[PDB]
Amino acid sequence: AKPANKLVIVTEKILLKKIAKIIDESGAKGYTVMNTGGKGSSDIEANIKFEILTETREMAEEIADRVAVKYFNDYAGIIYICSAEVLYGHTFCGPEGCSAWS
Amino acid sequence: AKPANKLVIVTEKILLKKIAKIIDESGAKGYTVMNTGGKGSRDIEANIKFEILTETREMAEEIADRVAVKYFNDYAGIIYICSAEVLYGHTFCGPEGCSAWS
Amino acid sequence: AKPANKLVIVTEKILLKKIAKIIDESGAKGYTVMNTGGKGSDIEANIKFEILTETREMAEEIADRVAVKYFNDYAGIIYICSAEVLYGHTFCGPEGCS
Numbered sequence: 513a514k515p516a517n518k519l520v521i522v523t524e525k526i527l528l529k530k531i532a533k534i535i536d537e538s539g540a541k542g543y544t545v546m547n548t549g550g551k552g553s554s555d556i557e558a559n560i561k562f563e564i565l566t567e568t569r570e571m572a573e574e575i576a577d578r579v580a581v582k583y584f585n586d587y588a589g590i591i592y593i594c595s596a597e598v599l600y601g602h603t604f605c606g607p608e609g610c611s612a613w614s
Numbered sequence: 615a616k617p618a619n620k621l622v623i624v625t626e627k628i629l630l631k632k633i634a635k636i637i638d639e640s641g642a643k644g645y646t647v648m649n650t651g652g653k654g655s656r657d658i659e660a661n662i663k664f665e666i667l668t669e670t671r672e673m674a675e676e677i678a679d680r681v682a683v684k685y686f687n688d689y690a691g692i693i694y695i696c697s698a699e700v701l702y703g704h705t706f707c708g709p710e711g712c713s714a715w716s
Numbered sequence: 717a718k719p720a721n722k723l724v725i726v727t728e729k730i731l732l733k734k735i736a737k738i739i740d741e742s743g744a745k746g747y748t749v750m751n752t753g754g755k756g757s758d759i760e761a762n763i764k765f766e767i768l769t770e771t772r773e774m775a776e777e778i779a780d781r782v783a784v785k786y787f788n789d790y791a792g793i794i795y796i797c798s799a800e801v802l803y804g805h806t807f808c809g810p811e812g813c814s
């Protein structure tokens with residue numbers, strides 16, 4: 513298993529492409545996105561959630577910091593991080609797989 | 615980053631507003647919700663998943679207890695909890711922000 | 717609370733039933749599935765499963781069977797998170813999760 517940080521961004525749908533570009537520019541290998549609903553701060557609003565598995569904590573925080581500094585003054589959103597282990601993932605773990613041995 | 619408990623409730627779609635009402639009454643600061651499918655062990659059923667990040671474990675368990683007692687003896691549903699750290703979140707972290715140096 | 721492994725499988729939508737069948741055959745008591753989008757190697761419509769298992773070996777058995785059977789030919793990732801189940805009739809049994 514390969515340790516990963518799972519970065520989660522829940523935010524407004526209109527930032528989809530801008531956030532995807534930031535994800536791509538961080539070096540992350542991919543991302544999953546979904547339509548969600550939410551309340552913050554009749555009442556529910558449509559929003560999107562991104563999930564980005566990253567090899568390092570620093571890549572996850574780069575994406576988070578770049579998103580927040582650029583957009584979170586003006587747009588609703590939260591960003592949080594969970595620990596995960598990747599078991600299978602051609603691009604994430606490379607050709608040796610997620611449980612290569614030395 | 616601010617430690618959080620991510621409470622997850624997966625249940626029947628007809629309980630959307632009822633469970634939202636409990637979350638709103640609890641003092642949790644927000645929630646995310648999504649349409650899902652699922653099977654339990656009592657084809658795929660239409661259901662909903664809530665995610666509620668809470669500042670304390672006691673709040674998460676209070677929500678969970680209240681939902682479970684009020685509905686889960688009469689309706690299908692599971693509740694679980696994951697550890698998360700919040701990096702950005704106006705409401706969750708408050709005006710202090712998420713103490714980036716912690 | 718009862719410790720659980722949350723196995724997450726994100727893959728191509730066409731594998732929905734095939735993966736469901738493997739989950740069911742593993743002993744897992746249930747699963748959740750949702751429609752998502754993803755970019756790996758624009759966004760493509762795909763599906764995400766979440767399966768809570770009582771043991772880590774059951775989670776890895778599902779993962780291994782899925783990957784061997786499908787991941788040479790189909791796009792996908794599989795990862796695992798730690799969770800604790802608070803309420804879950806089948807998952808925790810008649811005594812509850814504690």
Ligand SMILES: Nc1ncnc2c1ncn2[C@@H]1O[C@H](COP(=O)(O)OP(=O)(O)O)[C@@H](O)[C@H]1O
Nearest residue numbers: 652653654655656690691746747748768805806
């Ligand atoms: N072991 C599990 N892993 C992932 N999701 C589950 C699991 N068990 C139940 N679920 C989800 O929770 C929903 C409610 O489950 P329920 O029908 O109450 O299960 P049970 O009757 O097995 O306790 C299911 O439709 C499914 O989406």
